[PDB]
Design a protein around this ligand. Structure first.
Ligand SMILES: Cc1ccc(-c2noc(C)c2COc2ccc(C(=O)N3CCS(=O)(=O)CC3)cn2)cn1
Ligand SMILES: Cc1ccc(-c2noc(C)c2COc2ccc(C(=O)N3CCS(=O)(=O)CC3)cn2)cn1
Ligand SMILES: Cc1ccc(-c2noc(C)c2COc2ccc(C(=O)N3CCS(=O)(=O)CC3)cn2)cn1
Ligand SMILES: Cc1ccc(-c2noc(C)c2COc2ccc(C(=O)N3CCS(=O)(=O)CC3)cn2)cn1
Ligand SMILES: Cc1ccc(-c2noc(C)c2COc2ccc(C(=O)N3CCS(=O)(=O)CC3)cn2)cn1
Ligand SMILES: *[C@@H]1O[C@H](CO)[C@@H](O)[C@H](O)[C@H]1NC(C)=O
Ligand SMILES: *[C@@H]1O[C@H](CO)[C@@H](O)[C@H](O)[C@H]1NC(C)=O
Ligand SMILES: *[C@@H]1O[C@H](CO)[C@@H](O)[C@H](O)[C@H]1NC(C)=O
Ligand SMILES: *[C@@H]1O[C@H](CO)[C@@H](O)[C@H](O)[C@H]1NC(C)=O
Ligand SMILES: *[C@@H]1O[C@H](CO)[C@@H](O)[C@H](O)[C@H]1NC(C)=O
Lengths: 336, 336, 336, 336, 336
C-alpha cells in the first residue's frame, strides 16, 4: 500500500529540471516569506553585530510538481530538497551565517496537489547593526535584517511577506531576552534596488531595541556620583588641615580618571562623545573644582582669612546644589 | 558462512524507501528516547548557555526491516544509517550542536528480527539557559534541554521517554562536576506545541543547578568584610590625627568602589541588582558612614568637644554591632 | 515549452572539457574583474589585518558556450559552475578567506549568446595590512588587496579592470563605517610579477584609511593633560606643606606611568615610539619636573629662602606656558 | 610488471563486505593498540582539559585480506581505508577531537600476507582532566585518556595493549614540554564496563603531572612575602608618627587584598580554599595584625606609655620570627 | 584543434593506478621540495607556536605520465590532482594546518613530456616553536618546520631540497615583518629517523629569530628605572618629614610590585627567572633599600643625629651610582 507514495515521488522528478525556475518564460515567480525568531541572540556593540536564530520559511508555486493521490500533502525532509529548484535567497547584511545539522539537517519540504511548495530552514545569522551611540546609554537602535535573491532579478523572482506584519515575523516569548536591551517590536518592508546585474527586490525586517539601563548605573554613574560627594566632604574640614584636604581632592580626581578608562573598556571605540562621557566630564569638573577651591583658599588664608572662610562655607552649599541640579537636567533631558 | 549476513543486509534495502516513515498511512510512528550525559559541560552565565555531551538513543519500529537468521540482532555503524529512515530530531534551544567524527563517527545502528531499530548518537550541545540572578549567588537554576521532530507533527511521530525518569536520563558520576554549580538532579517531561506547520510533541529534560558558593566568599565578601573592619579602626584614633583618619576613610571608600567593578567583571551585565550588590552597597555605606562621622566629629571638636568624644566612643560599639547584625540577616535570609 | 532551455544546457556541456581554458593554443584568455564592497570589516591593528566582504565578479569569453535561442541570456547558479572552466583566482595577501553558503551558495553564473560568461561570487576576506605607526594616531594607512591566477601565467590568462576605476571598485554607503578609521577612497592597479613558475599579472586594490582621532583624546590625551594641570597645583601651596606637595607629585607621576601602560594595551606591540608615546613622555617630564622643583625648593628653603619663593612663584607661570606651547607644536606638527 | 600489484588490490575487495568484522560468528576480534605522543599540548586548568597530539595505531587480523605475491607487505594510504572494515574506536572523555588533513590525510594502511592489518592515524584530542586543587600549586594530577569501541561489545571486539607499557605508550622527548607541569610518566590499563547496550572494554592511559612551581613564587608568594616585611617596618617608627605608620598599614592591607584577586584571575573558580589561599590569608593576618598593634599602641600611648614601648619594641622581634616560622611549616608541609 | 589535449589527458589516466608510487619495485621515488614563505605569521610566545603561510612545491618523476604532443607542458589545477599519485607529505610539528579554498583551491599541477610532475600547494601552518626564555628579551630563537612522508619509508620515498639553500626556501620581502621579532635568516637540513613503522627522512627548515627590543623598554624598563629615581628623591628631604619620605618609599615599592605582575601578563607562565625579572628584582631592592635607609635614619635621628646626616647625605651619591653601574653591567652582559 505504501508503494503508492514511492511511485508519486519518482513521477515528480521525471522530466524535472532543477536548474529552471517555475513559470519561466510564462510569468514571474512569487515567493512568500515568513520568519520565526527562536532566540534573538546577543548584540555585540563593539562589533556592531547581532546574532539571531530563525526558522526561515519560503512558499511558492511550481506546476511541475502537481500530483494526484489519497493525501493532500507530502511531508518530506532535506533528502529531496536538492533534487528540485529552490530560490537562491541570501542575507545582504549577514556577515556570517550557518545552519544546524544535528541530529539531521533542520530542513523541511512539503508539497500539495496544486504544486504549492513549502521550504522551511533553520538558521543562525550574524548580521551587522550600525549604531549611533550619541545618546548612549539612553539609545534606541533599529537592527535590520535584509535578504533577497542573488541571481534572479525583480523581473523573475519577487519576495513578498505573507499576510500582515504580525504573521510575517514572529518572536518567541523567551527569545526576546537580552541582558542590555529590550525588544520593543518588529517591522517589515520591501524595496527594489538597482545594481550592475539588474534590479532586485529586498525584504527588510527591523527590530526596535531600547537599551535597558541599570547596569551602567551600578557600574559608572553611582561610583561617579559617590566620588563627587566624597570630594565635597573636604569643604567641611579646616583649612589648616592641608594634607587631609589634599588627599580628598587628589584621590577623587584620579578615581574619576580611572572610571573614564574602565567605563569605555566595554564600550566600542567610537570617535565621539556619548551622554555618559559628558556626565563623567562634569563629575570630573566638580572634583577638580573642589581641589581648586582648597588651593585658592590655602593661598589667601593668611592675607585675607575672612574671605577664605566665606568661600569654604559657601561652597558647602553651592556644590551639592549644582550637582543635584545638573542631574535633573541630565536625566530629564535624556529620559524625555 | 559469513555470506549469510551479507545477503540479509542486501535483502533489507530491497524495495526500501528511506523517504517514508514506518507505519505511514497505517499508524503513528512512536519513538522511545533515552539519554546518557557523559559530561555536563561548563555553564557560561554571561552567555546564558551551557555545554553538554550526551549519548542520544532513539528506538522505534519498522516492519520493513524484519528478517530471519541465526542471530537475533545486527550490530552495525554509521555506514547503513543513511540508507534507511531516521527521525528528524532536533534541539529547539540548541544554539550550536556538533557531532564527533573521530576516529569514526560515534554512531550505532542495531536491528532485531521484529524490526525494532536502535539508533545511538553522540552529541555536544550548546543550549541556552535563561537565568534570574536575583538571589545570586544563592540562586538555583533549571537549565532545560528541548528536542523534537522538525517535520513530522504529533499525528505522525511521537516521542516518549522509555521506562521511568531515572532510566530515561542518566548522568555519569564524573560528569556532574562543575566549578560553580551542583547538579542536584534531573527531571523529564513532554508537552505538545501548536505552530504554523502543525502540532508537535516536545520532550524536555530539566537539570536542577544549585550554585556552590565559596568562590565569591573568597573573592568579594571577605574583601568587603575586612575593608569595613579596616574603616572602623579609625574610630580608635584621636580626633586631632586628621590626616591619619582621612586615609582610612578615603582608601576604604575607593577600595569598596573598585571591588564593585571587579566583582561584576565576571558577572553578566544584567540590568538589575543582585543579593551580592546589596551586600556591597551596605558595606559601602558603612565605610562611607565612618568617614562622615570623622568629618562631623572634626567639625565640632572645638565648639562642643564633649559630645565629639561620646560619638567617637559610641561609634566604636555601634558600627561593629550593626555590621554583624546585618550579616546574620543577610546570610539567614538568602540561606533559608 | 520550457524543455527548449533544458536541451540548450545539455548541448553546451556536450564535448566540453572543463579542464581547458578558452582560447587555448589560439589566443590569451582575458578576464575582466569588478568588485563591490558590501562592508569594509574591522581593522585589527594588533594583527595588521582587515576583514572585507565583497561581491567578486569575473567576466571572460568562451566560444565553446555559444548558443542560439529565444533568450539572449541564461541566468543560473552554482549548480552549473563546477561543470565548466573558471579561473583559479586567489588572493595573495589573504590570510583566511571563506564563502557564504546560506541559504544557497552566494554564486551566480550567466551566459550570453556570444559566449560571454559572468561569474559572481561573494567572499569574506581577512587580508594583511602592514602599517607604519610612526605618526600614530595621526596616521594614514593604505591597506591593499591583491589577487591573480595561481596556475595560469601572464601568457595564458590576464586580468584587467573593467571601465574606469570608479566602476571597477565600488563601496556601499553603509559599508564605509569603522569605529577608528575613515575610508577616504580607493585606487586600483596592475603589475606583472616574475616567479619560479612563470610570470603572472597581479591586480591590486588599495584602500586609503585616515584614522579618526577622538577616542584617544578621551582615553589618553585628556587624562595626561589634566594630570599635568593637577601637578602644577602644587606650586600654589606653601613650601612648609611638605606632605601635601609630595602627594601631588608622587600620585601624578604614578598616574602618568599607568596611563602609558594602559594606553599601549590596545596598541600593537611595535618596537618603536609613536607620536602618542612622545606626548606621554613629555607629560611625564612635566609632572616629574614639578616634583624636582619642590624637592629642590625644600632643600634650600632654609639656607636661601628668598630664592626659593622666586622659583616657586616663577614656576607658576613657566610650567603652564611651556605645556601650552608644546601642545601647539605637537598638534600643529602632526595635523599639518 | 607493476600491474601485478593492481590485480591483488582488486582481488582483495572482491566479495569483501566492509560492514562485517573479521571472525564474525567464528571468534572474537582482537585489536592491539599502541600510541605515540608527538606533543602533550597545553593543560587548561580553568577548563579542566588538556590537548594532546598522538599517532594512534591499531592492529588486528582479517583472513579475508590474505594474499600471495612477491612482497610481504602492501603500503597504502587513506584511499583504501574506507573500502574495508575498521574498528569504531572513540574517546569517551574526548570533548573535541579532530584529524589532520594536510597535505594529505595523515593516515596509513598496511597489510601482510597473513591478513594482519595496521591502521595508523594522527589525532589532536581535547580531553577532560578533573583536578583536585587542594594542594595547589604543590599538586600532582593524573590526566587520563580513555578509548574503546562504540558499537562492538566485549564479546565481539577486545582492545589490548601491545607488548609492555613502555612500548604501548611513547612520548617524544620534546613533546613533554609544558610551562606549568612536569610529565613524570605514563601508565596504561584496561577495564570492562557495563552499559545499557552491553559490556565494553575500556583502554585507559594515565599521565602523571607534577606542577612545576616557580611562576607562582614570582607572581604571588614573593609579593605577599615582601609586603609583610614592608608592614613590619612600621614597628621601627615612633608612635607619634601617626600618619606615617598609618600609610604602612593601610597600603599593605589593600596590597594584599588585590593580590588575592589578581592571583585567582588565572586560577579556576573552584569553590574551596587552596594552599596558596591559606598563605595569602596568613599574610593578610600579619599585615592586618601590625595595623592593630599600632592602633592599640596609639590608644594607650598617653595613659601607660611604658607598656606601649615594650609592645612596639617586642613586636619588632615576634612578627618576623612567626612569619619565618610559618613559612618553614608551610613549605615543609606541602613539599613533603 | 583543442580536442588533441583532451585525448592526451584521457590517455594518461588509462591504466593508471593512483594507489601505487612511481618506480615501485624498480627504484626509489625521489621528491624535490622548495618553499616560498608568503608571510611569516605571528609568533605566540604563550603558546610556543608560530603561524606561517607558504607555497609548498613538490617535484618528482612518474614514467606512467609520459606523453607526446605539440606542447612541452600541461598546466592544470586541483581537478586532476586527486586522479594521480601524490606523496603523503605531512608536518610533524604542525599543530594545526589548513589550506585555502577561495576562489578555487590554491593548487597547481604541471606535467612535462618526460613525466616530471610539479605539485604546488598553498598552506597556512601553525607549528610549535619551543623557546628558552632565559635571556629574554635579549633572546634568539630558532623556530623549525619539519615535514616528511607519513607512510613511505626512506627505502621508498626520499625528500631532498632543490639546488642550494637560498633557492630551496625563500621569504617574501614583506613577509618577514613581525612586531616583536627579526627574521635574521633561514637554514635547511635533512635527517633520517627510525620509528616503529620504519625509517623515514625528515626535512627541516629553521628560521632564526632575533627579538627586537624596544617594546619592553617603553613598557617595563623605563617605568622601573624612573620609579627608582623617584625613590632616591626621598634622600633630598629632611628627616623630620617622616610622612613625606614614607609616601615615596611605600608608593614606589608597590609600584614596582605591580609592574612585576603587569610585565608577566603577556609573558608566558614559565617556571624560571628571565633577565627582565632580574632587572625588576634589583629595581625592587633599590626602592626597598631606600625605605630601609629612611627607617634606619629615623630610628637614630635622636641618639646620634650626626651619623644620620652622613648616611642620608652619602646615600644621595651611592644609590644613583650603583644603579647606573648595574645598568651598564646588565645591558653590556646581555647585549654582548
Ligand atoms: C543581488 C546581487 C548579487 C550580486 C551583485 C553583484 N554582482 O557583481 C557585483 C559587482 C555586484 C554588486 O552589486 C550590488 C549589490 C548590492 C547593491 C546594493 O544595492 N546594496 C544595498 C543594500 S545592502 O544590503 O547594503 C548591499 C548593497 C549594489 N550593487 C548584484 N546584486
Ligand atoms: C517543529 C517546527 C519546525 C519549523 C516550524 C516553522 N516553520 O516555519 C515557521 C515560521 C516555523 C516556526 O514555528 C514555530 C516553531 C516553534 C514554536 C514554539 O512553540 N516554540 C516554543 C518552544 S521553543 O523551544 O522555545 C521554540 C519555539 C512556534 N512556532 C515549526 N515547527
Ligand atoms: C601565482 C603563483 C603560485 C605559486 C607559485 C609558487 N609555486 O612554488 C613556489 C615555490 C611558488 C612561489 O612563487 C612566488 C609566488 C609569489 C611571489 C611574489 O611575487 N610575491 C609578491 C606579491 S605577494 O602578494 O606579496 C606574494 C609574493 C614570488 N614567488 C608561484 N606563483
Ligand atoms: C560504548 C557505548 C556507546 C553508547 C552507549 C549508549 N547508548 O545509549 C546510551 C543511553 C548509552 C550510554 O551508555 C553508557 C556509556 C558509557 C558508560 C560508562 O560506563 N561510562 C564510564 C566511563 S566514561 O568515559 O566516563 C563514559 C561513561 C555508561 N553507559 C553505550 N556504550
Ligand atoms: C612517519 C610516521 C608516521 C606514523 C608513525 C607511527 N605509527 O604508529 C606509531 C605509534 C607511530 C609513531 O612513530 C614515531 C613517529 C615519529 C617519531 C620521531 O622520530 N619523532 C621525532 C621528530 S618529531 O617531529 O618530533 C615527531 C617524533 C618516532 N616514532 C611513524 N612514523
Ligand atoms: C518594484 O518594482 C515593481 C515593478 O512592477 C513595482 O511594482 C514595485 O512597486 C516596486 N517596489 C517598490 C518598493 O517601489
Ligand atoms: C498531545 O496530544 C495527544 C493527542 O492524542 C494527547 O494524547 C496528549 O495527551 C497530548 N499531550 C499533552 C501533554 O497534552
Ligand atoms: C605585463 O606584460 C605584458 C606583456 O605583453 C605587458 O604588455 C604589460 O605592459 C606588462 N605589465 C606591466 C605593468 O608592465
Ligand atoms: C573483561 O571480561 C573478560 C571476559 O572474558 C575477562 O576475561 C576480563 O578479565 C575482563 N576484564 C576485567 C578488567 O575484569
Ligand atoms: C639516510 O639514509 C640513507 C641510506 O642510503 C643515507 O644515504 C643518508 O646519508 C642518510 N641520511 C643521513 C642524514 O644520515
Amino acid at each position: 500500500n505504501i508503494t503508492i507514495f514511492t511511485r508519486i515521488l519518482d513521477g515528480l522528478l521525471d522530466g524535472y529540471d532543477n536548474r529552471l525556475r517555475p513559470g519561466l518564460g510564462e510569468r514571474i515567480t512569487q515567493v512568500r516569506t515568513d520568519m520565526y525568531v527562536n532566540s534573538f541572540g546577543p548584540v555585540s556593540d563593539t562589533e556592531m553585530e547581532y546574532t539571531i536564530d530563525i526558522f526561515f520559511a519560503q512558499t511558492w508555486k511550481d506546476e511541475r510538481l502537481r500530483f494526484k493521490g489519497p493525501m493532500q500533502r507530502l511531508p518530506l525532509n532535506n533528502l529531496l530538497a536538492s533534487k528540485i529548484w529552490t530560490p537562491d535567497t541570501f542575507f545582504h547584511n549577514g556577515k556570517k551565517s550557518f545552519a544546524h545539522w544535528m541530529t539531521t539537517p533542520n530542513r523541511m519540504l512539503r508539497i500539495w496537489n496544486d504544486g504549492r511548495v513549502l521550504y522551511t530552514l533553520r538558521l543562525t545569522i550574524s548580521a551587522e547593526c550600525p549604531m549611533d551611540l550619541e545618546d548612549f546609554p539612553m539609545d534606541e537602535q533599529n537592527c535590520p535584517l535584509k535578504f533577497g535573491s542573488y541571481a534572479y532579478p525583480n523581473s523573475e523572482v519577487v519576495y513578498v511577506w505573507t499576510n500582515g506584519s504580525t504573521k510575517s515575523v514572529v518572536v518567541a516569548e523567551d527569545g526576546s531576552r537580552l541582558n542590555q536591551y529590550h525588544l520593543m517590536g518588529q517591522t517589515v518592508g520591501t524595496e527594489n534596488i538597482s545594481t550592475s546585474t539588474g534590479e532586485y527586490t529586498i525584504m527588510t525586517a527591523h527590530f526596535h531595541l531600547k537599551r535597558k539601563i541599570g547596569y551602567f548605573v551600578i557600574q559608572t554613574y553611582l561610583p561617579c556620583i559617590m566620588t563627587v560627594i566624597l570630594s565635597q566632604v573636604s569643604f567641611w574640614l579646616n583649612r589648616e588641615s592641608v594634607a587631609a584636604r589634599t588627599v580628598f581632592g587628589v584621590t577623587t580626581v584620579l578615581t574619576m580618571t580611572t572610571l573614564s578608562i574602565s567605563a569605555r573598556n566595554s564600550l566600542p571605540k567610537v570617535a565621539y562623545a556619548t551622554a555618559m562621557d559628558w556626565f563623567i566630564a562634569v563629575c570630573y569638573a566638580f572634583v577638580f573644582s573642589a581641589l581648586l577651591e582648597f588651593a585658592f583658599v590655602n593661598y589667601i588664608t593668611k592675607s585675607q582669612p575672612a574671605r577664605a572662610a566665606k568661600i569654604d562655607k559657601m561652597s558647602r552649599i553651592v556644590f551639592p546644589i549644582l550637582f543635584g541640579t545638573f542631574n535633573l537636567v541630565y536625566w530629564a533631558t535624556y529620559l524625555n
